[PDB]
Amino acid sequence: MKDFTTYLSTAPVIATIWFTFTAGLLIEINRYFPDPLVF
Amino acid sequence: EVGPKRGSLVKILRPESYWFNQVGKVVSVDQSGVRYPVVVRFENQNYAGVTTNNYALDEVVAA
Amino acid sequence: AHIVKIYDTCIGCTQCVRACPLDVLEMVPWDGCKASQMASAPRTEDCVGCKRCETACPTDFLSVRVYLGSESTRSMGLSY
Amino acid sequence: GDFLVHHAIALGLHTTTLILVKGALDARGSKLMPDKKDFGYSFPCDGPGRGGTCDISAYDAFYLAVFWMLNTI
Amino acid sequence: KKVKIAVDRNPVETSFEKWAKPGHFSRTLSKGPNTTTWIWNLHADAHDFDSHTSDLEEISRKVFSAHFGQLGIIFIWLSGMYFHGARFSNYEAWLSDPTHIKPSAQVVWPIVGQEILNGDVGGGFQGIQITSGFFQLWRASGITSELQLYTTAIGGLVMAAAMFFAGWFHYHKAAPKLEWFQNVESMLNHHLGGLLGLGSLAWAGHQIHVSLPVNKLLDAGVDPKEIPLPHDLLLNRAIMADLYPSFAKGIAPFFTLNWSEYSDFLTFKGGLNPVTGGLWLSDTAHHHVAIAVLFLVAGHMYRTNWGIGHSMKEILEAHRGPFTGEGHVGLYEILTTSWHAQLAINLALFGSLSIIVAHHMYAMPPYPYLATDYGTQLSLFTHHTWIGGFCIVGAGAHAAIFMVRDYDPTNNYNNLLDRVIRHRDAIISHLNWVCIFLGFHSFGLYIHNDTMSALGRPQDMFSDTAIQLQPVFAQWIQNTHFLAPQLTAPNALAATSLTWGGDLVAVGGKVAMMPISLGTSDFMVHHIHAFTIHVTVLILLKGVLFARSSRLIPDKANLGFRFPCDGPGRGGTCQVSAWDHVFLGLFWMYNSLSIVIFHFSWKMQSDVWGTVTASGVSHITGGNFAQSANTINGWLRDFLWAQSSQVIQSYGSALSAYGLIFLGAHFVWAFSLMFLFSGRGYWQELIESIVWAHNKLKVAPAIQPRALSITQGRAVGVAHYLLGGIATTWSFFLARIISVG
Amino acid sequence: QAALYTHHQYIAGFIMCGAFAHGAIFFIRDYDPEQNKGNVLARMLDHKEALISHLSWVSLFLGFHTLGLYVHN
Amino acid sequence: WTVPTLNPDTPSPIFGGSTGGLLRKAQTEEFYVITWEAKKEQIFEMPTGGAAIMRQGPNLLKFGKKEQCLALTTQLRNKFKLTPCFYRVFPDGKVQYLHPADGVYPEKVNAGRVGANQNMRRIGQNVNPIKVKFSGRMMSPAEI
Amino acid sequence: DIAGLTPCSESKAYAKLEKKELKTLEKRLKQYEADSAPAVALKATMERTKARFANYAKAGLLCGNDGLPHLIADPGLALKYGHAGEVFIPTFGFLYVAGYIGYVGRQYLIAVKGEAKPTDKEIIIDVPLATKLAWQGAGWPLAAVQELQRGTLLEKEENITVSPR
């Protein structure tokens, strides 16, 4: 399990998870707050 | 006994060297009258992939 | 012909001579290093300028330099 | 539209200036080629050693900058 | 001498320990990164199995398991296509109206205004019009409901799991030995008989029992819900006997050599189905039956464990003439010990086969309602053509890899390969001359026509009205094929295709297939194709023959297959490696295939595709190919400028995405020009200044940032060039063919 | 009007590229660090990394934002 | 040690011929001849393309440039552990011994060799090009 | 108002564009049923368009002759005519998030630079340390100002490598 977690801690896996989280957050924000142009 | 102590950290003063103004570990100092007796090993390799070089007594400073 | 120069930072590792594909460099006795040898270029008329010797040099900066000069049949590596 | 195209013009000017200025300042040498001044203004390269030195001369910097100048104009 | 199953038990332990140690496969990469170059190297040598170790057994085991992983990926992709057709498509509605409803199998989520991409494809459905042709393929197989597609998707997922389990089991539990992989005779016997023959026989059985009755009822006008299920057709002989009277006799006429009784479902109709526009399914079923018998016969040729059969080594050694020295001596050892040589041969034939598939598929449409779907036809032809060209370039690359790494002069003293390498200078010189001759006599005609047209002298051009260059050989071949069913094909009811000649076949008011006439413009574009193919062959052949040595660098083999250069010496030795020859061959293949697909699109939209009116056929472009394809200005104005209108004004509609990609593809391609025209020395010095700024703020990374290598720069540039150009043509073709076709 | 404006702008761009190219040629062939010791000319090369880095930052910002606004529109 | 003399009547390796051989330069400018001694008959790779068979004993070959001769020398030394030597032949018949020049390979130091083109300084100690300007021709600061 | 523009709530081209978008959506909707998936999706798109136009007009945006909103980047004009929400507040918001990311990355590099193999930590991310630094990066402006005032933000010129000039 330690080796598997270390593999999950590698740069491509971490980048994939982080970008999926960031993209999901932005998509959900644009979904609940459609068409945001100004503050 | 001439030159820096073995295992100490020195700063390279050679302008054309890749490790100029960088810190490297002293490996060995030649006791003869060679031009570059100090042997310095670095953690970061240069463009050629080398991590060690030879420098003179005045080209290295204890830093 | 190209200009090949050897500098005093040479450690006499003979790697540049072994990498030369046209037998331009050689080793001569010397006293400025532990190996007691120094690179030399006595046959620069046959140098083509491939710079393999510079690739094989481990000193920082290089101890052997090749400056491309006049071009001839030998320097251009022409077999015709 | 004028604002956006003016920024595109600014980008072109700054990038062309970056290539030209960098080639003029690194003409005498750099970390990759500490003795570039000993080879003249225009030379092919320094060979594939030290990772590769294609388009390392200042002439090559001007060369790459001509494309950016054409794009800016 | 004995063909058996040789397997080693548990050679590699299944663990995650190596998953946390990147670059473990390479001895140089296992040390760890010091510079960013290492990262790129980690991906550039991941599948270079022969570079990790010199053991042929380990390389073969890795290749076999990698093949299983690839098959698992393919099964996942196919399962996804079936799932999309079963849950996010309009296949059921398209079945009741395939001539008006546009096929769609992709729906987008209503986010950031992208819901506009869900166009009105018909049948009360909103989505993206697909051009893969899965609807026509599913209709040809007899699929009438989404449940069948869903079941096929689940089966595909199960097959993918089995493929991945097979790869793991064959790499960690039961790994085959080297002698098992070297059984080329047994492998060829099984692949010919078992795989190909049994697959053709099984598909023939499905076509005879499912595709033929379901499609017969579909063409007869029966609703898909009223059509009996395939198992109902396979369970009783009454329904099949009513649809096909020969089924009343069972399998008795097959064993009593009364095959003529089965003429109701095994015919030689030829031509196309006037209802659907595709090939007759009885002809395809009979075709698969004949293919199965032929391949099953071919699968009993090689010697495996008994006296009967052939030894490929003996056959190769027996072929020797007075003009070739020894002959094929040593070829059996080369193909049984080098994976790169086999990959080169397989990639070459595989790419050629893909191109042949594209041609045969547009000329003889095998699926129902496929010919009238101009978008699917154009997309299928273009896609298969590109895959074929890429595989051909890869064949040249692997031939060069074999010549650099696995070539041995001690086993090639006076063979065919030795003599070829001995006169490589003559081969390359003659190919260079024929390339120059073809270039002049192909491009100069267009330049002459452009100059004469601009000078107000249309009577001096190379056109049909002026000096003409008619393809008499192609026209004679077309007439021969058109007249074949009356003299040289007494049992054929019609010709193989309608492109040779005859009447046109139209489905739903659209021309499914009509004769294709060849004139001066066709002659010129054919010579252009020949010239481009010859130049691509010249670059790839030069990179293969001169991979080990040349008059410039006598020890190129010592420098390897993929190296940047040999320094600025000898005047400059930039791009001397075989890798660089493949790098240039990719550009030439792109040029050749792009002109090929451009010619196909213009010819089909000008003389074949179009609507059917009262006493006349109106084409998409109005038949302007014969008058405008003889000049470069005609290709730029009537084909590129005129047809790009659909992709540039697609904004605000469902095809707007294509327009966006049309712009994005122009970016990537131009992006390629930054890597192809520059050198890494400039970028390395620029990185030095950026590293200085980072060191000032103590944000310099431990992994030293290095510019991309010379080879990596060339690879990135060619990859972006190919992606941008092909994506540009893809967006333009799809938007135009969907809006006007 | 169009031809004259385009002609003069292209001529100006080529001349500007030549000005910087000759500046690089001056650094290689005529610059003497001993004679220009401590003046503004030597100080330019003393902090050339800062100039190149800031030119790179300005070009990166302008390119990223101009291209982003265009793709967004 | 004494400088060897070329023997034109020396058997050549078994080769069927190729198109990468000598050209008009050999008949008008110069060519190169490599000779070596083989302990047994063995198949080797020709630098001009193809596979030849070296015979037992003396072996002579002709090449258009010195690089081909040195490439063959490297192949024979590293693979078959032989000791080849080559000469430069002119159309008039003049023969000039080339490698190993002093009878000893250049990778190993030998007595009697006089150093040439050696600068008793480092690269960073080279003068600026302005001090070398207005010379007889294009001269680099490393040439002085 | 500013630069001769007019508010979007009074621009005729703005209302005309809204009517045009609703007209093309209604035209596409006229070919479907009244209780089907495409009808519901088109109605949702129409409601989103109406809400977007009303929200843009309610925000006080300025529209040009084309009927499209125009942003004010000058801080004086934005703060004087109530346009700070266009380019000012998003500027500071981006500065906060960008400096957040940069500070967290710099802290991670400084933290892993004192270990045995910093490159190993650069390719294999230490998730606990990265998460702790990501959570602690909320006070990046205060910490950055303190680092700049103490002189520990920059590195000395003698410790940075340079070319031989």
Ligand code: CLA
């Ligand atoms: C979960 C089960 C499992 C485990 C624990 C291992 C563990 C191991 N395998 Mg193994 N293997 C497995 C299943 C497994 N394997 C399967 C299912 C196959 C068949 C494909 C193989 C075939 C195989 C081969 C041929 C080799 C190994 C090797 C190894 C060893 C090191 C390589 C490695 O894992 O790095 C990690 C590597 C990866 C994570 C790469 C995964 C790539 C997958 C298969 C493809 C993904 C496709 C992707 C989605 C599509 C690309 C598109 C892109 C946009 C994403 C290691 C001990 C190697 C070895 O022993 O070295 C000598 C060896 O060469 N395995």
Ligand code: CLA
């Ligand atoms: C009638 C016997 C038979 C059949 C059907 C196959 C079929 C196949 N072989 Mg195989 N092979 C055989 C005999 C057979 N082989 C023998 C006797 C040898 C030893 C001399 C080999 C050695 C061999 C090698 C070295 C390789 C193959 C490969 C392949 C695959 C090629 C991929 C493809 O394009 O096809 C189309 C793909 C499909 C049709 C997918 C369907 C796959 C199903 C499961 C059919 C496979 C049947 C096969 C006999 C497995 C059943 C065994 C059982 C224990 C499960 C293919 C599925 C390649 C591979 O490994 O791919 C993974 C490859 O590298 N074969």
Ligand code: CLA
């Ligand atoms: C791979 C191809 C394939 C397959 C699978 C089939 C299959 C079938 N065909 Mg067919 N056919 C084919 C190709 C094929 N065909 C071709 C190429 C032609 C053109 C010549 C025809 C022309 C044709 C005709 C004209 C007819 C069929 C018919 C049939 C069906 C009955 C066969 C029969 O009469 O008795 C054959 C008997 C056997 C095959 C033996 C069965 C073996 C069983 C499964 C063994 C199971 C044993 C096991 C231990 C049981 C234990 C169970 C366990 C749970 C305990 C059958 C489902 C008939 C039909 O469908 O009627 C409408 C029929 O009339 N075919």
Ligand code: CLA
């Ligand atoms: C059956 C097909 C096949 C197979 C098995 C191989 C196998 C191999 N090839 Mg090869 N090749 C092929 C086809 C194939 N090739 C084709 C069709 C071409 C023409 C393009 C080439 C050209 C080629 C060259 C020039 C080289 C190889 C090399 C190699 C070897 C090293 C593995 C590697 O490439 O590194 C790892 C693989 C990768 C890093 C993949 C790169 C990813 C690409 C750039 C993405 C492509 C874009 C993608 C489709 C679009 C995605 C969109 C994007 C936005 C995400 C390996 C044995 C190399 C070699 O032999 O080493 C000396 C070598 O340099 N091949």
Ligand code: CLA
């Ligand atoms: C390379 C393609 C090509 C071809 C085939 C032609 C052909 C022709 N051009 Mg043209 N042209 C071309 C390119 C080409 N052009 C280009 C690129 C341009 C733009 C620069 C022009 C601009 C141009 C102009 C302005 C004009 C022509 C004209 C003509 C016509 C007469 C020219 C003539 O009499 O010259 C004489 C030809 C020769 C002296 C050599 C003939 C070649 C021989 C047959 C080859 C011998 C090979 C032989 C088989 C080897 C035997 C070996 C052994 C057995 C002995 C002619 C049909 C004229 C015209 O208007 O037409 C009415 C004219 O005024 N061209």
Ligand code: CLA
């Ligand atoms: C007052 C203006 C001026 C002057 C006096 C000079 C003077 C000089 N320059 Mg310079 N330069 C200038 C402006 C100027 N330049 C401009 C505007 C540019 C930007 C384009 C350059 C960029 C530049 C570079 C990069 C270099 C020089 C070099 C040189 C020196 C010698 C090279 C030479 O001229 O040989 C002869 C020049 C040529 C033979 C030019 C080749 C022909 C060109 C490409 C024109 C081709 C046009 C084409 C034929 C159009 C046909 C179209 C039609 C057929 C359809 C020389 C002292 C070189 C140097 O200093 O050496 C180290 C050096 O490398 N210049």
Ligand code: CLA
């Ligand atoms: C359309 C082609 C193109 C593009 C986009 C660029 C872009 C750039 N050039 Mg360049 N150049 C080009 C052609 C091009 N060049 C050509 C033909 C030449 C002559 C050979 C040059 C020569 C040249 C030189 C000599 C220099 C540049 C420099 C630069 C950079 C300037 C900084 C900037 O503007 O930041 C903006 C960044 C971009 C515009 C890149 C695009 C960003 C993408 C679209 C975002 C990522 C997409 C998405 C998020 C992820 C997709 C990835 C996918 C696989 C998943 C920039 C990256 C200068 C430099 O490096 O500055 C420091 C530099 O000195 N160029």
Ligand code: CLA
């Ligand atoms: C990035 C460059 C930049 C540029 C090109 C401008 C340009 C402008 N600013 Mg400005 N500004 C900037 C940055 C910039 N600003 C920043 C970073 C801040 C935050 C400190 C401000 C805060 C600011 C304020 C508070 C005001 C302007 C105003 C103005 C306008 C006229 C004043 C002037 O030109 O002097 C340069 C601007 C300054 C030196 C800031 C102080 C304002 C000076 C003292 C003028 C104010 C007097 C009076 C209001 C002038 C208008 C008279 C009448 C028409 C009402 C002008 C178009 C004025 C305006 O037109 O209000 C709508 C205004 O009052 N700016």
Ligand SMILES: CC1=C(/C=C/C(C)=C/C=C\C(C)=C\C=C\C=C(C)\C=C\C=C(C)\C=C\C2=C(C)CCCC2(C)C)C(C)(C)CCC1
């Ligand atoms: C607002 C205004 C005004 C003012 C103005 C001004 C004050 C301005 C300016 C200006 C300027 C300020 C300009 C500029 C220009 C510049 C440029 C265009 C650049 C560049 C280049 C260079 C600088 C080069 C250098 C070099 C090198 C690189 C090396 C050494 C040598 C040489 C020098 C060659 C007035 C009131 C009057 C009027 C109204 C408007």
Ligand code: SF4
């Ligand atoms: S450039 Fe090449 S030929 Fe010249 S001395 Fe160096 S290695 Fe030898």
Ligand code: SF4
């Ligand atoms: S490679 Fe460099 S250090 Fe070694 S002998 Fe040659 S010149 Fe001297």
Ligand code: SF4
């Ligand atoms: S590829 Fe690059 S390094 Fe090699 S010779 Fe060409 S320019 Fe020089």
